[PDB]
Design a protein around this ligand. Structure first.
Ligand SMILES: OC[C@H]1O[C@@H](O)[C@H](O)[C@@H](O)[C@@H]1O
Ligand SMILES: OC[C@H]1O[C@@H](O)[C@H](O)[C@@H](O)[C@@H]1O
Ligand SMILES: OC[C@H]1NC[C@H](O)[C@@H](O)[C@@H]1O
Ligand SMILES: OC[C@H]1NC[C@H](O)[C@@H](O)[C@@H]1O
Lengths: 822, 822
């Protein structure tokens, strides 16, 4: 039922068994170098780009899962074991993995020898550091040999897995047994030609021996768990020539009773200017200057400790912007630690690389990285700022955009499709969230190219004009926006009609013509068009702003007139003008996306929570009856049981999975916020709980996946695996639940001209205090909360009552005490 | 060392240990459905296309190599083992694997139970059949449980290994324990949607139980060697929902001493008409009729035995066209069995799918499948006719062509680049060989589209015109052919200048302009331009033929005037117009390709073998001294030790591998042929022996790969791994060495109007007889061969002498007796 427990004071999740339901990972690094690290040391690392600069190899869908990562074989008297458990799977007297913020510790103990490894990526460094502590826990002296192991990737991860006819002949290493700080191995494939970068794997000691060739170290016919070298007790000292390069060092250790030793291993990513690639005039020997420097920065324990403390200080400081103290310690741990930590990861990774996303085809999604901003702008505004410029530079002059860009190059590509008509409006979403947060109006003036074209620069604001005008000029017969390839739901392809197997719905060519419309984009246009009009007003553009609110008006009125089914919002009109998401159809009656997003947009809001005549209220009640489950809200009901050619990808999933009846968690917080907008705090918070890691920890054997982060997808009611998650970690659910909980449930949300304090969470959290730093000042917000249905807040500020729920921004350096009664 | 032996009478290679240096595979099937089967039962199967219809999953670069395939776990009173040895690796009393023609047989014995499995793909079937015979070889009764196992792939092999974020939720199966002939499992992923196909895995008996979920069968934390289910002794009857579908049946047997039992397993690929996909109106249950009909065609051992006998008769028939009886049993087994079998494999596979080619990026290559025709035309000429039509249909109107086509759709693509200028001329090579073989002049009238455009058809001959004109109208400043992206050598990229890492030289954009020319294409053009001339004269195209010979003469003169270095032929002019492959540069002084091919074209051939002044002789002596290793001839010398930006991919390989000083065996037969042209039989035969599998069997530990088929590359003298092969099976070396030995060494080659008999093999083959069927007549050719340098045959035919070396074709039905004196 549980496989570990949170450690709130340490900011760690503690895994107390190797035998979890699935591999459970951490991400190390927050800047430009990243590692996937499972609780069994499986995973890999990459610089900037998981497809293009992957340092170490990892196999998806391996048998068993996650047999492959950073291993340390201990040979004690002929007995070989690994403290990560896998691959050898020797009985351990004690095992524990601690996943922390930017680091993890994995401990195994066997027959009087305890081996603990601290893994992290140091701030400022493109390296993964491991600090090993071997301890004699027996009453007698003890000796052992330790064999380190890492398997290299040949940089291009797609090439590495497919192009052996070339790549088995190109692997190249160097060995440096007597370096300045210890022993090192260089992985230097293709440095001969166009690469200016190599990898290093070294230790802060003169190793007894080494191995660079996988086949020699593992042995023929053997798995990682039977590697010949550790069993033999002595390195072969292999020098790779093609095949499969690895990094491994042997170190002999001797320990008195109770005595320990630290060893420091470093996996690094090094570059040289072209001028300085080589150490020799013949150009055969890599220039090792930067690696000697890197290894010198991690030559001692003290230096590792000092970096782990700077990393802890960096996390303390990131988490100082938004905190809560409440009566619900699960709510608290989510808000203060886990949900913000995940937001940092998604900002960096988008949907690119996890234990489910393979870090090949997906780079940095236009819609996804825009939505990640919403959860990230409060953490490091300046990096959010630059991300906005990078994303907007992949937009086209007509307002549409590349659906994603390649992280190394910042260039758009069509590798997972083009012409998704929801994409343009998300850019407004992210900019609005950024300006509300930081107040940096001058970003609107930043010159930004179209599709990276030298000389095409216009102000960022003009880019938002192109997004807005894209929708206004791409409406169909009902005044709703044309959907194109798909909207937010990638599997709703109304211009597709595909009969050909094995061509991606995402990528396959679309039919010209038709009248296919999205009720979802309409709700999105209403929400974010209003935001754009506001941006325009601030810029003194009264002509532009006026026209804009008119269009918003026309589209709102189109949603009530032509997008309302009777008890919920319509989903779409197909190519031929048929309604999708109507009670008139047998399957796919109600789809969740327009319900939450329409009501978020104020569409169909009546007199209050108990205004039973109001579309918003009918919509949400229907969401509740027809879509709700103990695990969250399923995307549509009922799921499709046969292929519907005119809807594209959606009906191709078996019922209850992904977009065909799955709980697609990213869209539940839309419903959450909808319910707070309508004044049903209690129900809003209920939905929050159903999908939130801290609340699902007690059902770990059912969720299966990491119990400390949101997943993309939980199997829905119509699936035999109801409650089982897939695709953990990399989901917009993280940014969107942070919004929901922080800004609409706890109620604290930056606006243009003040801080909105508008609790709506219902009776299960009767008091809390939020600490929010906003525009240089600190708001202490003490909330006493009846939870009464429909009841909203009154504020007194610094001893004096104020009107409404917006506290105008105090000057930098202030502390403002706001007293809240709901 | 050796790890087995040839069995000529059985036409098998006999592997006597599991512990080979590398997995050794056979190919099953010769029609539309194929299996890669290793001596450990490893590999996978596909229908028509390895990328788009892969039935079963295989992991390239697994640890260990080749742990996944068709396994049969035996649980004998709790002991679990596999007769394939992998994956359980339990100690076997006896092991043997026999690779034969379209079948293999693998036998494993442990603790009084012998388990023999016969694998093949039957004629006219899309299925892999296994016949399993279990024998009690002990002196006491036995009870054992047999668990079969295969792991499905989700059809699209690329999506399977990269698109988990979708595909983990789409896997579906149906289980039929009580079918008409036994138990069956249906793998039907995506049948719900666009696929009209599904796989079956069945046994000819009612199974005790089954399994369809991989995780349940294998167990958490377990590899395939530690599978839980067989260890537990009973199936878990698991029914997959997503994740990893498998096919598995359990069958308990009880055997008295010396008793045996047969079991027939079938892995079938089935299709239904769209109107007939579903058993039920609700469209939920697959229509099983064709799967029931398939299982019924293999419900008995008798039915298997008959099919295997028909497969034998089919091969005996294929091999009845060319054979030799000589004093060299190594030569004979290559000419009679192995090289012809290989030629059928290359005709079918091109270069897409092997244990090195991943069946992903590569489909059927234009140059590749054209050149394969040279060694396949005599086997099944009607299939070569169709193949020529399929190829020519991927050609553009300007005469240039798509570099390869998708096996499933027959439509060309640029996935591995475009604008390889040697491509167009290979079309003529293929048609010339085919017509010489068959005399089917009518093929030149076949209407053939460009780029498959309906309505674009012109006669085949007209395609050849376009090929010929392409080269005429693409010459540089020396009158030598413009190189384009590359010629035959994919890595000689003169229009490239890439400094961006990670980007394929094959697909990356090229510079317009410069003056880069290829001596190889020049030689190629002289050789095949001449055939083109001949075909135009015979179509009655006098002026065209005259014009064609004029062009050939210019290009021949240009080779001698501008493509000559002094002691060898030049390789090329670079973008700047500088010579490539000259003694004036320090690396890449001499390249093999234009040496073999210019001399085959007759360029610089003098008065005889002893004329030291003929450029052909000098060229070939330079190739001997500079390129010769005891493992074959390296591509160029010295190999490049630094990246040469003007040359492309070539210098990106470490010295001695692939195109940078590897023995690229495909170009070795060109030198073999060349040598026979100058009358140096002994040396030509020497070169043939150096790379030929039967002669390298005695160095199996050095070669490492299959000792019965040619490999693409043998590491060169500048490699640390000198003599170790990579990329076995799929190589043009098969067809080119067949051409060399059958036609130039042994000397029996079809021409347009008679059969040329021109032995040039030197004194190691003093006497031999060739039985050649050509144009429905059998030629019995008896050769007394002095092997004396430059000595050339004279003939008598049916007791009467004739002039020169061409025997006019006798009419169908006759036996012609040719007595040959050299
Ligand atoms: O695309 C196929 C080509 O790839 C190159 O990288 C290899 O060196 C060539 O041997 C091969 O012909
Ligand atoms: O290309 C990415 C898209 O792939 C589809 O196969 C999935 O159903 C979507 O969830 C995903 O957004
Ligand atoms: O289709 C829904 C959803 N699939 C998952 C994708 O990452 C996201 O971009 C998309 O909005
Ligand atoms: O580059 C030489 C050679 N490499 C291997 C390819 O399959 C072939 O088409 C090419 O000619």
């Amino acid at each position: 039922m549980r496989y570990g427990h949170f450690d709130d004071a340490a900011r760690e999740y503690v895994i107390t068994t190797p035998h979890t339901p699935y591999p459970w990972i951490n991400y190390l690094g927050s800047e430009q170098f990243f590692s996937l690290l499972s609780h069994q040391a499986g995973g890999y690392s990459f610089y900037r780009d998981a497809k293009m600069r992957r340092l170490t190899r990892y196999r998806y869908n391996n048998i068993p899962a996650d047999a492959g990562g950073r291993y340390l074989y201990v040979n004690d008297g002929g007995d070989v074991w690994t403290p990560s458990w896998l691959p050898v799977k020797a009985d351990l007297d004690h095992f524990e993995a601690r996943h922390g913020l930017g680091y993890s510790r994995i401990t195994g103990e066997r027959n009087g020898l305890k081996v603990e490894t601290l893994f992290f990526v140091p701030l400022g460094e493109n390296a993964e550091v491991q600090k090993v502590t071997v301890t004699n826990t027996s009453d007698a002296p003890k000796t052992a040999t330790l064999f380190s192991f890492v398997e290299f990737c040949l940089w291009n991860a797609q090439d590495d897995q497919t192009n052996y006819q070339r790549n088995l002949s190109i692997g190249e290493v160097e060995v440096e047994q007597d370096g300045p700080h210890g022993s090192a191995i260089y992985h230097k494939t293709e440095y001969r030609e166009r690469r200016d970068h190599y990898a290093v794997f070294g230790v802060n000691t003169r190793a007894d021996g080494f191995d660079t060739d996988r086949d020699t170290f593992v042995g023929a016919y053997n798995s990682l768990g039977e590697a010949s070298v550790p069993r033999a007790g002595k390195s072969a000292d292999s020098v790779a020539s093609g095949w499969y390069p690895i990094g491994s060092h042997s170190v002999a250790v001797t320990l008195q009773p109770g005595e320990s030793r630290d060893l420091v291993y470093v996996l690094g990513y090094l570059e040289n200017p072209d001028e300085e690639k080589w150490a020799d005039d013949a150009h055969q020997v890599v220039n090792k200057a930067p690696a000697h420097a890197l290894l010198g920065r991690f030559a001692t324990s003290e230096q590792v400790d000092a970096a782990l403390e700077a990393l802890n200080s960096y996390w303390t400081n990131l988490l100082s912007t938004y905190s809560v103290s409440s009566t619900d310690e699960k709510l608290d741990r989510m808000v203060n630690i886990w949900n913000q930590y995940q937001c940092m990861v998604t900002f960096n990774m988008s949907r690119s690389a996890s234990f489910f996303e393979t870090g090949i085809g997906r780079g940095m999604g236009f819609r996804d990285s825009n939505q990640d901003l919403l959860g990230f702008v409060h953490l490091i505004p300046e990096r959010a700022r630059e991300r906005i410029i990078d994303i907007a530079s992949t937009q086209f002059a007509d307002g549409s955009a590349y659906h994603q860009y390649q992280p190394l190059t910042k260039r758009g590509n069509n590798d997972i499709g083009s012409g998704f008509n929801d994409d343009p409006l998300w850019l407004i979403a992210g900019v609005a969230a950024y300006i509300k947060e930081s107040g940096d109006w001058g970003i609107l003036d930043e010159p930004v190219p179209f599709d990276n074209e030298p000389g095409s620069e216009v102000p960022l604001f003009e880019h938002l004009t192109r997004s807005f005008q894209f929708t206004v000029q791409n409406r169909g017969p009902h005044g709703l926006p044309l959907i194109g390839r798909a909207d937010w739901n990638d599997c709703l392809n109304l211009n597709c009609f595909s009969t050909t197997p094995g061509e991606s719905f995402q990528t396959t060519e679309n039919q010209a013509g038709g009248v296919a419309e999205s009720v979802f984009i309409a709700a999105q246009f209403v929400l974010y068009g209003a935001e754009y009009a506001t941006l325009a007003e601030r810029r003194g553009l009264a002509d532009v702003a006026t026209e804009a609110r008119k269009y918003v008006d026309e589209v709102r009125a189109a949603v009530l007139e032509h997008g309302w089914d009777g008890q919920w919002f319509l989903r779409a009109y197909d190519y031929y003008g048929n309604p999708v998401g109507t009670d008139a159809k047998p399957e796919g009656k109600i789809w969740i996306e327009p319900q939450g997003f329409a009501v978020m947009a104020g569409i169909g809001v009546g007199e209050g929570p108990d205004d039973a005549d109001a579309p918003a209220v009918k919509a949400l009640d229907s969401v509740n009856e027809m879509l709700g489950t103990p695990h969250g809200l399923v995307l549509q009901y009922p799921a499709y049981t046969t292929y519907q050619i005119e809807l594209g990808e959606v009906s191709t999933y078996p019922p209850g999975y992904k977009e065909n009846g799955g709980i697609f968690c990213h869209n539940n917080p839309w419903v959450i916020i909808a319910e707070t907008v309508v004044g049903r705090g209690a129900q809003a918070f209920d939905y929050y709980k159903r999908i939130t890691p801290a609340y699902r920890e007690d059902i770990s054997d059912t969720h299966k996946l990491e119990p400390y982060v949101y997943a993309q997808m939980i199997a829905g009611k119509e699936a035999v695996r109801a409650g089982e998650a897939k695709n953990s970690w990399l989901t917009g659910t993280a940014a969107w639940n942070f919004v929901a909980v922080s800004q609409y449930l706890l109620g604290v949300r930056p606006d243009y001209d003040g801080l909105v304090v508008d609790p709506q969470i219902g009776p299960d959290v009767p008091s809390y205090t939020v600490t929010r730093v906003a525009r240089g000042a600190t708001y202490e917000i003490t909330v006493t909360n009846s939870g009464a249905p429909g009841a909203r807040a009154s504020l007194t500020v610094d001893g004096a009552p104020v009107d409404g729920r917006t506290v105008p921004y105090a000057p930098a350096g202030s502390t403002v005490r706001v007293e809240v009664t709901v």
